[PDB]
C-alpha cells in the first residue's frame, strides 16, 4: 500500500538515472481507441494487418500472466477497451529486451504503443505492439472493478476510470444541457451572462453567500437566482433571453440540495402562465424521448435496493391548485387574507392535528408550504405534475391571477415529490411591487415598462438525477461540496 | 423632470380607477416585427392588405401627429423598427374615442396593436391599427440618443443603453455568437463540456488574490475559483481526454479597461497534445472565428478610441512567436543568466527597471520583474497582427512542463492582441516529482500520482476577445452588468 507507492516512486527515479524519460513530452498518436474499434471490429479471427503501423495510446487496466513471450493487457481510452497482444515474434528488439520492457508495465500505467491491428485466434480485437513506451505511470494501486464510498466524490477521477456508469451519468448531464440550449436557441432565445456578485441577492427565498472585494472595499452577495437582471434585459428589448449557470444558496446540504447548483432561467416577452405550462410539457416530453426513445423511464425512488417506479412523461401533465387541494384533503376553508389571525391559527391546528411538524417562524407562507409538502407534493410519483395558482404571499414576483383574487399565475413542476421547475406570469406593474414602494436598480427598470412576460427556472441537477437514476445530487455533480 | 414621472404614475392610477387595466395579462400576437418586415418589405407604395388582420406588439419610440385624425408612431421590437400609421377612418370606434386613446400614448410605451399591414404613399412599411391598447407604460422620460453616450448610465442602466443605442445590441449579440462558435468549435473536435466547482478549499491555479466566502452549515470558509485549471486536469486523469469549461472565474484584484473582478474564461485540456498543437489550435481558432464573423481575416480596431485613428489587425495565420527571455536580452542588450532566482540576475533586472524608469513590482520577485520587463519591451511589439510570447521561464510557470531542449524554460505560450493577453496555454507538468510545490492542494497532487497523460491546456479571455471583435476599448462595454462602484 504505502510500500507500493514508494517502490513505484523509486522505479521512476531509477528509470531517470538510466537516461529514460518516464514522462515524455509528445507522442504523436494516429488513431483513438474508439476509432480503432470502429475501423477493425469486423476483422476475421486471427487476421493480422501487419503492414498497417499505428500509434495508439490508452491506460493499462489489466495485465495478464506473463507467458513465454506472450503478454496480454487491457487498454482503455474514452470509455472503451481493446486488447494489447504483445508477441515476441513481432517485438522490435532494437529498442530493448522484450521481457524486461513489459515486466516494467503496471496496472494504471498510461502507455503509447507502436503496432498493428488484428484479432487473436479467439477473435478478440487487439493491438499488436512492436514497441511500447511509458507515457505516464500510475504510482498508486487502483481499485478493482466493483471495488469502488466518499472516494467517488473526493476522487472523481477514480470513479470515472473504474465505474462505467460514472462516465455515462455525466455524459447524459452534458447531453441534457446541450439539448436545453438548442431547444431555447431553436425558438429564438438569446443566451446571456449576468453578474455572479451583486449589492443585493434576489429573487428567491434563501440565505446568500457574502464575500468582499478588496480594492473597491465592498461587500458583495453571491446570486441566489438570475431572475432580476434577466428581467431588466426584457425591459432592454431582449424579448427572448436566458441563462444557464451556477447559482449559490447558503443553506443546508442533502440529497437534493447542493450549496452551488446549476440553474436555467429564461424570460419570454408577451408569453404567460399558459405558454409556460405548454413549454414545460413540450420540453420534458421531448427531452426524455430524445434520451430514451420513449416517454417512460425507470427510476429507483426508494433506492437501488428497492423496486423502481415508472415515470410517464407523456403530455399533458396534471395541474393541481395548491389552495383548493389543501382545503379538499383537509375539509377546511382557508379564508383570505391567508395571513389573518383566524386563517393562520386554522392552518396551525391542521399541522398539529395531522401530526405534521410546525415551521418556524409560523408565517402564512411557511404554513402553506408545509401543508403543500405533506398533502400535495407527493400526490403523483408516476408522472410529472404541476402545483399551480400559489397565493400572492408566497409569490412576491408573480403577477396576480387574472380571475382568482389573492392568487398568482404561477406553476411548479414536481418529479417524485421534488421541485424541478418554477415559473409564473411576471409581475410588471411597479405599483404592485410592494417592496419597491428588492434592488433599487430592479425597481427602477420596471418603471420603464416591463411588457407582459413569462419567466421560468429549471433545476438542472435535479433533472439530471431523475434521468440518470440517482437518489443524490452528489451523483450528478463532478466535484460536489464535501466536508473536509 | 420628476414631474413627468409623478404625472405618469397618477395617470396609471386614474386608468385603474376608470376600470381599465394599464397592465393586461396577455396579448396574443400573431407575428413579430422582424417577421413583419421580412413578410411585407416587398409590398408596393401605397399598398394595403386591409383584410389581413394581425396582432403585433412593440415599444413606441416616436410620436408625431397631424390634425387629430392621423397619428404616427415608431414601433420597435427585437432591434428593428416599423411605422405605426393610425387613421381615424380605419379606427374601431367601438373600443373608444380615437383622439383620446392615442392622446394617452407616450414615448417608451409598450403597446399591443390590432391592425393590417401596408406601405405609405412614400413607401414606408407600416402597421395600420384598427385597435391599440397599452400593455405597459414607461413612467420615465426616455432619453434621446445623445442623453446616454457617454456616461455611467449605460453601465448601471444597461436596459436603457440596449433600447436607445443600436450598436449596443449588436455588441452583445456578437459576444454570444463568439461563445457559440467556440462551443461548436470544441464540440466538433470531440471535446466534452463540464462544470467544475465555483467554490473550493484552496484557489489555484494562477497568480491572483481570491475572493473569500463562508458556508454556514459546513462552518467553512471557501475560495471562489480564480481559474479552472486544477479540476479539469483531474478530469483528464479520469480518462476524459478532451474536456473544457466555459464559465466565470473570480479574481480579487484591480479594476480597469481590461480587468473585471468576475470574468468569463474558457479552459480546455487536450490529452496527448503539446505546445505545438496548441499554437496550431490558437491560429485555427482566431482566424476561423474572425472570418466567421466578418468574411475576412482583417478587421479595424480603434485602439485609441473612436476619436483617433483606427488600426488594422490581420488575423491571417501564422502569427509571430517571440521567446520572452531571449527577446528581453536583445532589446535591453543584457544577458539574464540562470537561475533567474539568483540575487545577481535580480539585481540586473532591477537596474534595467531603474535605468528605464519602469514601475517596480512590489514586491519585486524574479517572476514579476520578468513579467514587467516583457510588458515594457515586448508586449507591444505587434499591433497590426496577433502574436505569441513563448518559452516562459519555469519560475513564471509552476504548472507548465519544462522545455524539452531549453533548460530553465517551459513549453508555454501567451497570445496578444494590441498588447493585451487573450490566451494562455502550455504543455502540462505531469510528473508529480517535478511539481516540487506538492512535496494548490493535496487533492490535485494525489491525482497527478495516478498518472496524468502528456497533455496540452489552454485558457481564453473571452471578454477581452469580444472587445477586439466588437471594437471596444473597455471590458465594461462587453459585459452586460459590469462591476461598478455604487
Ligand atoms: C432554479 C430552481 C427552480 C425550481 C427548481 C430548482 C430548485 C433548486 C433549489 C435548490 C436549493 C438549494 O439550496 C440547493 C439546490 O441544489 C437546489 C436545487 O438543486 O434546486 O431550481
Ligand atoms: C483565462 C485567461 C487566460 C489568459 C488571458 C485572459 C487573462 C484574464 C486575466 C484577468 C484578470 C483580472 O483580474 C480581471 C480580468 O478581467 C482578467 C481578464 O479578463 O483576462 O484570460
Ligand atoms: N428565480 C426563480 C425561478 C424563476 C421563476 C420565474 N420568474 C427561482 O430561483 O426559483
Ligand atoms: N489557468 C490558466 C489557463 C490555462 C493554462 C494552461 N494550463 C490561466 O488562468 O491563465
Short mmCIF file of C-alpha atoms in Angstrom, two decimals, chain A:
data_model
loop_
_atom_site.label_atom_id
_atom_site.label_comp_id
_atom_site.label_asym_id
_atom_site.label_seq_id
_atom_site.Cartn_x
_atom_site.Cartn_y
_atom_site.Cartn_z
CA UNK A 1 0.00 0.00 0.00
CA UNK A 2 2.35 2.72 1.24
CA UNK A 3 5.13 0.42 0.06
CA UNK A 4 3.67 0.15 -3.45
CA UNK A 5 3.86 3.91 -3.94
CA UNK A 6 7.41 4.05 -2.57
CA UNK A 7 8.52 1.31 -4.96
CA UNK A 8 6.93 2.96 -7.99
CA UNK A 9 8.41 6.27 -6.81
CA UNK A 10 11.81 4.57 -6.76
CA UNK A 11 11.21 2.93 -10.14
CA UNK A 12 10.54 6.35 -11.68
CA UNK A 13 13.80 7.66 -10.23
CA UNK A 14 15.69 4.52 -11.29
CA UNK A 15 14.43 4.97 -14.85
CA UNK A 16 15.64 8.58 -14.90
CA UNK A 17 19.10 7.50 -13.74
CA UNK A 18 19.20 5.14 -16.73
CA UNK A 19 18.53 8.08 -19.05
CA UNK A 20 14.96 7.01 -19.77
CA UNK A 21 12.18 9.60 -19.71
CA UNK A 22 9.23 8.14 -17.76
CA UNK A 23 7.32 11.30 -18.69
CA UNK A 24 7.94 12.05 -22.42
CA UNK A 25 6.68 15.36 -23.87
CA UNK A 26 4.94 14.35 -27.08
CA UNK A 27 3.70 11.07 -28.51
CA UNK A 28 2.01 11.58 -31.87
CA UNK A 29 -0.86 9.09 -32.00
CA UNK A 30 -2.61 8.30 -35.27
CA UNK A 31 -5.95 6.90 -34.09
CA UNK A 32 -8.18 6.82 -31.00
CA UNK A 33 -9.29 3.61 -29.27
CA UNK A 34 -12.97 4.14 -30.21
CA UNK A 35 -11.89 4.89 -33.79
CA UNK A 36 -9.71 1.78 -33.71
CA UNK A 37 -12.59 -0.45 -32.64
CA UNK A 38 -14.88 1.03 -35.30
CA UNK A 39 -12.38 0.50 -38.12
CA UNK A 40 -11.27 -3.03 -37.19
CA UNK A 41 -14.04 -4.71 -35.18
CA UNK A 42 -15.07 -6.83 -38.17
CA UNK A 43 -11.69 -8.45 -38.85
CA UNK A 44 -11.65 -12.23 -39.16
CA UNK A 45 -10.40 -14.25 -36.20
CA UNK A 46 -6.61 -14.46 -36.25
CA UNK A 47 -6.46 -11.95 -39.11
CA UNK A 48 -3.48 -9.58 -39.00
CA UNK A 49 -2.78 -6.30 -40.78
CA UNK A 50 0.95 -6.48 -40.15
CA UNK A 51 1.78 -3.80 -42.74
CA UNK A 52 -0.51 -1.22 -41.13
CA UNK A 53 1.57 0.56 -38.48
CA UNK A 54 -0.33 2.51 -35.81
CA UNK A 55 0.38 4.82 -32.91
CA UNK A 56 -2.19 4.33 -30.17
CA UNK A 57 -2.49 5.45 -26.54
CA UNK A 58 -4.50 4.29 -23.55
CA UNK A 59 -4.38 3.23 -19.91
CA UNK A 60 -3.46 -0.33 -18.97
CA UNK A 61 -6.33 -1.61 -16.84
CA UNK A 62 -5.37 -5.28 -16.81
CA UNK A 63 -2.15 -7.25 -17.14
CA UNK A 64 -2.31 -10.96 -17.82
CA UNK A 65 0.05 -13.64 -16.53
CA UNK A 66 3.40 -13.13 -18.24
CA UNK A 67 3.66 -16.05 -20.65
CA UNK A 68 6.64 -17.40 -22.51
CA UNK A 69 6.87 -14.47 -24.88
CA UNK A 70 3.21 -13.58 -24.95
CA UNK A 71 1.82 -10.73 -22.96
CA UNK A 72 -1.74 -9.64 -22.67
CA UNK A 73 -3.17 -6.33 -21.45
CA UNK A 74 -6.43 -4.42 -21.45
CA UNK A 75 -6.13 -0.90 -22.87
CA UNK A 76 -8.77 1.76 -22.22
CA UNK A 77 -9.45 5.23 -23.59
CA UNK A 78 -12.59 7.34 -23.97
CA UNK A 79 -14.54 4.68 -22.08
CA UNK A 80 -13.76 1.83 -24.46
CA UNK A 81 -11.25 -1.03 -24.39
CA UNK A 82 -9.19 -3.13 -26.79
CA UNK A 83 -6.69 -5.90 -26.10
CA UNK A 84 -2.92 -5.46 -26.14
CA UNK A 85 -1.29 -8.58 -27.54
CA UNK A 86 2.46 -8.23 -27.18
CA UNK A 87 4.15 -11.07 -29.05
CA UNK A 88 7.88 -11.85 -29.03
CA UNK A 89 7.90 -12.56 -32.76
CA UNK A 90 6.68 -9.06 -33.57
CA UNK A 91 8.80 -7.26 -30.98
CA UNK A 92 11.31 -4.67 -32.17
CA UNK A 93 14.40 -5.93 -30.35
CA UNK A 94 16.37 -2.85 -31.44
CA UNK A 95 14.52 -0.81 -28.82
CA UNK A 96 15.20 -3.14 -25.88
CA UNK A 97 14.78 -6.54 -24.24
CA UNK A 98 11.25 -7.90 -24.63
CA UNK A 99 10.60 -9.38 -21.18
CA UNK A 100 12.49 -6.59 -19.41
CA UNK A 101 10.41 -3.91 -21.13
CA UNK A 102 6.96 -5.37 -20.42
CA UNK A 103 7.87 -6.51 -16.91
CA UNK A 104 8.01 -2.82 -16.01
CA UNK A 105 4.39 -2.19 -17.01
CA UNK A 106 1.98 -1.88 -14.10
CA UNK A 107 -1.79 -1.58 -13.95
CA UNK A 108 -2.94 2.01 -14.36
CA UNK A 109 0.08 2.97 -16.46
CA UNK A 110 -0.53 5.25 -19.41
CA UNK A 111 1.39 3.93 -22.40
CA UNK A 112 1.87 4.76 -26.06
CA UNK A 113 2.06 1.84 -28.46
CA UNK A 114 3.54 1.43 -31.93
CA UNK A 115 1.94 -1.59 -33.56
CA UNK A 116 -0.57 -3.09 -35.98
CA UNK A 117 -4.25 -4.11 -35.67
CA UNK A 118 -5.52 -7.68 -35.57
CA UNK A 119 -7.61 -10.25 -33.76
CA UNK A 120 -6.49 -13.10 -31.53
CA UNK A 121 -7.29 -16.65 -32.60
CA UNK A 122 -10.22 -16.48 -30.17
CA UNK A 123 -11.43 -13.42 -32.09
CA UNK A 124 -10.58 -10.70 -29.59
CA UNK A 125 -9.83 -7.37 -31.26
CA UNK A 126 -6.28 -6.41 -30.33
CA UNK A 127 -3.36 -4.14 -30.99
CA UNK A 128 -0.06 -5.94 -31.58
CA UNK A 129 2.85 -3.78 -30.43
CA UNK A 130 6.30 -3.68 -32.00
CA UNK A 131 7.19 -1.15 -29.31
CA UNK A 132 5.59 0.14 -26.11
CA UNK A 133 6.55 3.41 -24.44
CA UNK A 134 5.65 4.56 -20.94
CA UNK A 135 3.94 7.95 -21.10
CA UNK A 136 2.72 8.46 -17.54
CA UNK A 137 2.89 5.93 -14.71
CA UNK A 138 0.28 5.16 -12.06
CA UNK A 139 2.12 5.31 -8.73
CA UNK A 140 -0.79 4.09 -6.59
CA UNK A 141 -2.81 0.89 -6.70
CA UNK A 142 -6.12 1.41 -8.50
CA UNK A 143 -9.24 -0.21 -7.02
CA UNK A 144 -10.55 -3.29 -8.82
CA UNK A 145 -13.84 -3.15 -10.72
CA UNK A 146 -16.76 -3.30 -8.28
CA UNK A 147 -14.19 -2.27 -5.68
CA UNK A 148 -15.10 1.42 -5.55
CA UNK A 149 -17.65 5.30 -0.62
CA UNK A 150 -16.94 9.03 -0.30
CA UNK A 151 -13.95 8.38 -2.56
CA UNK A 152 -16.26 8.72 -5.57
CA UNK A 153 -16.95 12.34 -4.62
CA UNK A 154 -13.50 13.28 -3.32
CA UNK A 155 -11.61 11.40 -6.02
CA UNK A 156 -13.96 11.63 -9.00
CA UNK A 157 -11.20 10.65 -11.44
CA UNK A 158 -11.08 7.21 -9.81
CA UNK A 159 -14.85 6.86 -10.18
CA UNK A 160 -14.59 7.76 -13.88
CA UNK A 161 -11.83 5.22 -14.52
CA UNK A 162 -13.36 2.25 -12.70
CA UNK A 163 -17.14 2.68 -12.63
CA UNK A 164 -18.58 2.53 -16.13
CA UNK A 165 -21.90 4.09 -15.11
CA UNK A 166 -19.99 7.16 -13.95
CA UNK A 167 -18.97 8.38 -17.40
CA UNK A 168 -22.44 7.63 -18.72
CA UNK A 169 -24.07 9.71 -15.99
CA UNK A 170 -22.01 12.81 -16.71
CA UNK A 171 -22.27 12.35 -20.46
CA UNK A 172 -26.05 12.38 -20.05
CA UNK A 173 -25.77 15.57 -17.97
CA UNK A 174 -24.00 17.34 -20.82
CA UNK A 175 -26.45 15.88 -23.35
CA UNK A 176 -29.23 17.32 -21.20
CA UNK A 177 -27.77 20.83 -21.06
CA UNK A 178 -26.87 20.70 -24.76
CA UNK A 179 -30.46 19.75 -25.59
CA UNK A 180 -31.79 22.54 -23.40
CA UNK A 181 -29.53 25.09 -25.09
CA UNK A 182 -30.59 24.04 -28.60
CA UNK A 183 -34.24 23.90 -27.52
CA UNK A 184 -34.19 27.52 -26.39
CA UNK A 185 -31.98 28.60 -29.31
CA UNK A 186 -34.22 27.00 -31.96
CA UNK A 187 -37.09 29.11 -30.63
CA UNK A 188 -35.34 32.47 -30.89
CA UNK A 189 -33.92 32.75 -27.40
CA UNK A 190 -30.76 34.71 -26.68
CA UNK A 191 -28.25 33.43 -24.09
CA UNK A 192 -26.60 36.00 -21.82
CA UNK A 193 -24.46 36.27 -18.70
CA UNK A 194 -25.50 38.30 -15.67
CA UNK A 195 -23.34 39.11 -12.61
CA UNK A 196 -22.45 36.46 -10.03
CA UNK A 197 -21.76 39.22 -7.50
CA UNK A 198 -24.30 41.89 -6.60
CA UNK A 199 -25.04 44.52 -3.95
CA UNK A 200 -28.17 42.53 -3.12
CA UNK A 201 -29.48 38.99 -3.59
CA UNK A 202 -32.89 38.27 -5.07
CA UNK A 203 -35.04 36.90 -6.30
CA UNK A 204 -35.83 33.85 -4.19
CA UNK A 205 -36.09 32.93 -0.52
CA UNK A 206 -32.62 31.82 0.54
CA UNK A 207 -29.69 32.95 2.67
CA UNK A 208 -26.87 34.28 0.41
CA UNK A 209 -23.11 33.79 0.37
CA UNK A 210 -21.33 37.03 1.18
CA UNK A 211 -17.80 37.93 0.11
CA UNK A 212 -15.63 41.05 -0.02
CA UNK A 213 -13.96 43.00 -2.74
CA UNK A 214 -10.69 44.43 -1.59
CA UNK A 215 -9.85 47.45 -3.77
CA UNK A 216 -13.45 48.64 -4.00
CA UNK A 217 -13.70 47.85 -0.28
CA UNK A 218 -17.17 46.46 -0.91
CA UNK A 219 -19.21 43.57 0.49
CA UNK A 220 -20.79 41.57 -2.34
CA UNK A 221 -23.52 38.93 -2.28
CA UNK A 222 -23.44 35.81 -4.45
CA UNK A 223 -26.54 35.48 -6.62
CA UNK A 224 -29.24 33.10 -5.40
CA UNK A 225 -31.06 33.36 -8.74
CA UNK A 226 -30.84 35.08 -12.13
CA UNK A 227 -34.42 36.38 -12.27
CA UNK A 228 -33.88 40.10 -11.61
CA UNK A 229 -31.10 41.03 -14.11
CA UNK A 230 -32.73 38.92 -16.83
CA UNK A 231 -36.00 40.81 -16.38
CA UNK A 232 -34.13 44.09 -16.76
CA UNK A 233 -32.93 42.76 -20.12
CA UNK A 234 -36.55 42.17 -21.14
CA UNK A 235 -37.02 45.85 -20.37
CA UNK A 236 -33.96 46.43 -22.54
CA UNK A 237 -35.68 44.86 -25.53
CA UNK A 238 -34.21 41.36 -25.44
CA UNK A 239 -37.64 39.76 -25.72
CA UNK A 240 -36.37 36.18 -25.51
CA UNK A 241 -33.42 35.77 -23.17
CA UNK A 242 -31.94 33.15 -20.84
CA UNK A 243 -29.01 31.98 -18.77
CA UNK A 244 -27.60 28.57 -17.88
CA UNK A 245 -25.22 28.90 -14.96
CA UNK A 246 -24.38 28.44 -11.29
CA UNK A 247 -26.43 29.99 -8.52
CA UNK A 248 -25.47 29.97 -4.86
CA UNK A 249 -27.69 29.42 -1.85
CA UNK A 250 -26.29 29.37 1.66
CA UNK A 251 -28.43 26.72 3.32
CA UNK A 252 -28.44 23.03 4.26
CA UNK A 253 -26.96 20.16 2.28
CA UNK A 254 -28.81 16.96 1.45
CA UNK A 255 -29.73 14.58 -1.38
CA UNK A 256 -31.49 17.33 -3.33
CA UNK A 257 -29.58 20.37 -2.07
CA UNK A 258 -26.06 21.41 -3.00
CA UNK A 259 -24.78 24.90 -1.97
CA UNK A 260 -23.93 25.71 -5.58
CA UNK A 261 -26.14 24.22 -8.27
CA UNK A 262 -26.79 24.77 -11.96
CA UNK A 263 -29.96 26.59 -12.95
CA UNK A 264 -31.54 27.79 -16.15
CA UNK A 265 -33.88 30.74 -16.23
CA UNK A 266 -35.44 32.17 -19.36
CA UNK A 267 -37.79 35.10 -19.78
CA UNK A 268 -40.24 35.24 -22.61
CA UNK A 269 -41.89 38.53 -23.55
CA UNK A 270 -45.63 38.51 -24.33
CA UNK A 271 -45.96 34.97 -23.01
CA UNK A 272 -47.90 33.93 -19.91
CA UNK A 273 -48.71 31.12 -17.46
CA UNK A 274 -50.39 29.09 -20.22
CA UNK A 275 -47.45 29.48 -22.61
CA UNK A 276 -45.18 28.36 -19.78
CA UNK A 277 -47.18 25.22 -18.96
CA UNK A 278 -47.18 24.17 -22.61
CA UNK A 279 -43.44 24.83 -22.83
CA UNK A 280 -42.73 22.65 -19.81
CA UNK A 281 -44.81 19.81 -21.22
CA UNK A 282 -43.08 20.21 -24.59
CA UNK A 283 -39.57 20.36 -23.15
CA UNK A 284 -39.65 17.48 -20.68
CA UNK A 285 -41.54 15.15 -23.03
CA UNK A 286 -39.18 15.84 -25.93
CA UNK A 287 -36.08 15.73 -23.71
CA UNK A 288 -36.95 12.35 -22.21
CA UNK A 289 -37.80 10.99 -25.65
CA UNK A 290 -34.54 12.35 -27.04
CA UNK A 291 -32.58 10.44 -24.40
CA UNK A 292 -34.52 7.17 -24.28
CA UNK A 293 -36.68 6.79 -27.39
CA UNK A 294 -39.73 6.73 -25.13
CA UNK A 295 -41.68 8.91 -22.70
CA UNK A 296 -41.36 6.34 -19.92
CA UNK A 297 -38.33 5.89 -17.68
CA UNK A 298 -37.48 3.69 -14.72
CA UNK A 299 -36.42 5.41 -11.50
CA UNK A 300 -35.39 3.96 -8.13
CA UNK A 301 -37.31 6.37 -5.89
CA UNK A 302 -36.63 4.28 -2.79
CA UNK A 303 -33.05 3.42 -3.73
CA UNK A 304 -31.23 0.74 -5.76
CA UNK A 305 -32.18 -1.93 -3.21
CA UNK A 306 -35.92 -1.37 -3.64
CA UNK A 307 -38.20 -1.84 -6.63
CA UNK A 308 -38.13 1.14 -9.03
CA UNK A 309 -41.16 3.07 -10.30
CA UNK A 310 -42.14 4.09 -13.81
CA UNK A 311 -42.35 7.78 -14.68
CA UNK A 312 -44.54 8.63 -17.67
CA UNK A 313 -43.55 11.90 -19.32
CA UNK A 314 -46.33 11.74 -21.92
CA UNK A 315 -48.14 15.12 -22.08
CA UNK A 316 -50.17 16.61 -20.79
CA UNK A 317 -49.40 16.60 -17.07
CA UNK A 318 -51.94 17.05 -14.23
CA UNK A 319 -52.48 20.55 -12.83
CA UNK A 320 -53.26 20.83 -9.13
CA UNK A 321 -54.33 24.06 -7.44
CA UNK A 322 -52.46 24.35 -4.16
CA UNK A 323 -55.07 26.11 -2.01
CA UNK A 324 -58.07 24.14 -3.25
CA UNK A 325 -56.25 20.84 -2.84
CA UNK A 326 -55.23 21.58 0.76
CA UNK A 327 -58.81 22.63 1.53
CA UNK A 328 -60.15 19.44 -0.07
CA UNK A 329 -57.88 16.94 1.68
CA UNK A 330 -58.46 18.79 4.95
CA UNK A 331 -62.18 19.55 4.71
CA UNK A 332 -61.37 23.14 5.64
CA UNK A 333 -61.79 26.58 4.08
CA UNK A 334 -58.77 28.88 4.38
CA UNK A 335 -60.30 32.36 4.20
CA UNK A 336 -58.23 35.29 2.94
CA UNK A 337 -56.21 37.11 3.90
CA UNK A 338 -54.20 33.93 4.42
CA UNK A 339 -52.03 35.83 6.91
CA UNK A 340 -55.02 36.74 9.08
CA UNK A 341 -55.09 35.63 12.71
CA UNK A 342 -58.05 33.34 12.02
CA UNK A 343 -56.58 31.57 8.98
CA UNK A 344 -53.05 31.24 10.37
CA UNK A 345 -54.31 29.64 13.58
CA UNK A 346 -56.53 27.37 11.50
CA UNK A 347 -53.56 26.21 9.43
CA UNK A 348 -51.58 25.66 12.62
CA UNK A 349 -54.34 23.44 14.02
CA UNK A 350 -54.20 21.37 10.82
CA UNK A 351 -50.46 20.94 11.28
CA UNK A 352 -50.86 19.91 14.92
CA UNK A 353 -53.84 17.62 14.27
CA UNK A 354 -52.22 15.72 11.38
CA UNK A 355 -49.02 15.18 13.27
CA UNK A 356 -47.09 17.45 10.86
CA UNK A 357 -44.13 19.47 12.20
CA UNK A 358 -44.61 23.23 12.71
CA UNK A 359 -42.45 25.63 10.68
CA UNK A 360 -40.56 28.46 12.38
CA UNK A 361 -41.43 31.24 12.09
CA UNK A 362 -45.14 30.26 11.79
CA UNK A 363 -45.83 32.74 8.97
CA UNK A 364 -48.65 32.31 6.47
CA UNK A 365 -46.38 31.39 3.56
CA UNK A 366 -44.35 28.90 5.63
CA UNK A 367 -47.52 27.14 6.79
CA UNK A 368 -48.93 26.95 3.27
CA UNK A 369 -45.64 25.49 2.07
CA UNK A 370 -45.59 22.84 4.81
CA UNK A 371 -49.21 21.91 4.11
CA UNK A 372 -48.40 21.58 0.41
CA UNK A 373 -45.35 19.42 1.11
CA UNK A 374 -47.45 16.96 3.10
CA UNK A 375 -50.83 16.86 1.33
CA UNK A 376 -49.88 17.62 -2.27
CA UNK A 377 -46.23 17.36 -3.36
CA UNK A 378 -46.38 13.54 -3.32
CA UNK A 379 -49.82 13.17 -4.92
CA UNK A 380 -48.21 11.83 -8.09
CA UNK A 381 -44.99 9.82 -8.33
CA UNK A 382 -45.74 8.04 -11.62
CA UNK A 383 -45.62 11.24 -13.68
CA UNK A 384 -44.59 14.90 -13.51
CA UNK A 385 -47.28 17.31 -12.38
CA UNK A 386 -47.84 20.99 -11.69
CA UNK A 387 -48.83 22.66 -8.47
CA UNK A 388 -50.39 25.94 -9.57
CA UNK A 389 -52.01 29.22 -8.55
CA UNK A 390 -49.94 29.92 -5.43
CA UNK A 391 -51.18 32.71 -3.12
CA UNK A 392 -49.54 36.13 -3.59
CA UNK A 393 -47.97 35.89 -0.13
CA UNK A 394 -45.83 33.02 -1.44
CA UNK A 395 -45.09 34.73 -4.75
CA UNK A 396 -43.77 38.31 -4.37
CA UNK A 397 -42.69 38.46 -8.04
CA UNK A 398 -45.56 36.55 -9.63
CA UNK A 399 -48.33 38.52 -11.33
CA UNK A 400 -51.73 38.42 -9.64
CA UNK A 401 -54.13 35.80 -11.01
CA UNK A 402 -56.45 37.39 -13.56
CA UNK A 403 -59.63 35.79 -12.20
CA UNK A 404 -58.66 34.40 -8.80
CA UNK A 405 -58.06 37.30 -6.37
CA UNK A 406 -55.37 36.66 -3.75
CA UNK A 407 -53.71 34.12 -6.04
CA UNK A 408 -51.00 34.30 -8.72
CA UNK A 409 -50.42 32.83 -12.18
CA UNK A 410 -47.64 30.52 -11.02
CA UNK A 411 -46.58 26.93 -11.69
CA UNK A 412 -44.11 24.49 -10.10
CA UNK A 413 -43.43 21.09 -11.64
CA UNK A 414 -42.65 18.11 -9.41
CA UNK A 415 -40.97 14.80 -10.18
CA UNK A 416 -41.25 12.17 -7.43
CA UNK A 417 -42.06 14.90 -4.93
CA UNK A 418 -39.07 17.07 -5.83
CA UNK A 419 -39.38 20.52 -7.39
CA UNK A 420 -37.54 20.79 -10.71
CA UNK A 421 -39.31 23.73 -12.32
CA UNK A 422 -40.64 27.09 -11.13
CA UNK A 423 -42.43 29.55 -13.40
CA UNK A 424 -45.07 32.27 -13.50
CA UNK A 425 -46.54 35.27 -15.26
CA UNK A 426 -44.13 38.07 -14.40
CA UNK A 427 -45.47 40.89 -12.25
CA UNK A 428 -44.71 44.01 -14.28
CA UNK A 429 -46.81 46.71 -12.63
CA UNK A 430 -44.23 48.55 -10.47
CA UNK A 431 -47.03 49.92 -8.29
CA UNK A 432 -47.97 46.38 -7.21
CA UNK A 433 -44.36 45.59 -6.28
CA UNK A 434 -44.86 46.34 -2.58
CA UNK A 435 -41.14 46.09 -1.82
CA UNK A 436 -40.30 48.72 -4.47
CA UNK A 437 -42.55 51.32 -2.83
CA UNK A 438 -35.64 44.30 -3.65
CA UNK A 439 -32.99 46.19 -5.63
CA UNK A 440 -33.47 49.87 -6.44
CA UNK A 441 -31.94 49.14 -9.84
CA UNK A 442 -34.54 46.42 -10.45
CA UNK A 443 -37.44 48.54 -9.20
CA UNK A 444 -36.40 51.42 -11.44
CA UNK A 445 -36.21 49.19 -14.52
CA UNK A 446 -39.85 48.18 -14.05
CA UNK A 447 -40.79 51.86 -14.16
CA UNK A 448 -39.54 51.96 -17.75
CA UNK A 449 -42.02 49.31 -18.80
CA UNK A 450 -41.75 45.57 -18.45
CA UNK A 451 -44.01 44.08 -21.13
CA UNK A 452 -46.25 41.09 -20.33
CA UNK A 453 -43.72 38.34 -19.63
CA UNK A 454 -43.43 34.70 -18.67
CA UNK A 455 -40.47 33.52 -16.63
CA UNK A 456 -39.25 30.01 -15.87
CA UNK A 457 -36.50 28.41 -13.82
CA UNK A 458 -35.17 24.88 -14.15
CA UNK A 459 -33.25 22.87 -11.58
CA UNK A 460 -30.77 21.19 -13.92
CA UNK A 461 -29.01 18.97 -11.39
CA UNK A 462 -32.28 17.54 -10.08
CA UNK A 463 -33.46 16.88 -13.62
CA UNK A 464 -30.20 15.07 -14.27
CA UNK A 465 -30.74 12.94 -11.16
CA UNK A 466 -34.08 11.70 -12.48
CA UNK A 467 -32.81 10.94 -15.97
CA UNK A 468 -29.68 9.20 -14.69
CA UNK A 469 -31.42 7.23 -11.94
CA UNK A 470 -29.74 8.93 -8.98
CA UNK A 471 -31.01 9.37 -5.43
CA UNK A 472 -28.46 12.05 -4.56
CA UNK A 473 -27.44 15.30 -6.21
CA UNK A 474 -23.85 14.33 -5.39
CA UNK A 475 -24.02 11.74 -8.17
CA UNK A 476 -24.65 14.26 -10.94
CA UNK A 477 -22.03 16.77 -9.81
CA UNK A 478 -18.40 16.06 -10.72
CA UNK A 479 -16.95 17.75 -7.64
CA UNK A 480 -19.74 18.12 -5.05
CA UNK A 481 -19.03 20.20 -1.94
CA UNK A 482 -17.64 17.88 0.73
CA UNK A 483 -16.90 18.33 4.42
CA UNK A 484 -13.08 18.39 4.56
#
